[PDB]
Ligand binder design. Sequence first.
Ligand SMILES: *[B@@]1(C2=[C][C]=C([N]C([N])=[N])[C]=[C]2)O[C][C]([C][O])O1
Length: 237
Amino acid sequence: IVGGTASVRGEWPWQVTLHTTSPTQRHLCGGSIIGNQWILTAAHCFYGVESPKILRVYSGILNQAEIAEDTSFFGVQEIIIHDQYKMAESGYDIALLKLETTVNYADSQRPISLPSKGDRNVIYTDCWVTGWGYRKLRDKIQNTLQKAKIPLVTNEECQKRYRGHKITHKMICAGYREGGKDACKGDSGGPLSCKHNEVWHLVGITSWGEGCAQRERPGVYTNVVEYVDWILEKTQA
Ligand SMILES: *[B@@]1(C2=[C][C]=C([N]C([N])=[N])[C]=[C]2)O[C][C]([C][O])O1
């Protein structure tokens, strides 16, 4: 996260840090708890990932330092990638992780509500992006979870900032016309939480952008509401 600040412990209880144990354990991507056994994240996050066995999901984490060899985690039973996904920039950058065990909800770890179709006309004026990603373009995974408030921008405006790209309605952008605040490497799969009527909603999934926090280059996120049907179908037994 560029231009953000340290999060308060338990401030984003749905945020998880997805680690890979290969070659050595390290933060790979962000993710959001949306169900007792389900993490919603970005598809492109599993590039070069041949098996879910090397994945470890940690919930209730503020600082990466909290994660040690003796720290409990959730194993991943299955990685579900949208069959239409090819690459982040083309869209469909969404994936579900079915955990091997169920998450016991608490103030430190609970699910975030998915947006409803009857909310696409809703004007989110309080949206935040979070994660342990880079603070700049050339940096490293941050220890403390960072947060940054960022305004959503119309798709028409976003398309203007991304000539050469096709910003579809299945994407949603957010950022400052002057930049300064935005997601970066490591924040992928992270949630773009928005607050309406004081009820947190998972509006987007951190996906891509040109550089990080550059002026006139809004972050591009997966427009979650466009995938509620997909999510329901993939989560049902
Ligand atoms: B992601 C990721 C997601 C979004 C952005 N945003 C910008 N401004 N470039 C950068 C990086 O984080 C992990 C990586 C793939 O493993 O992509």
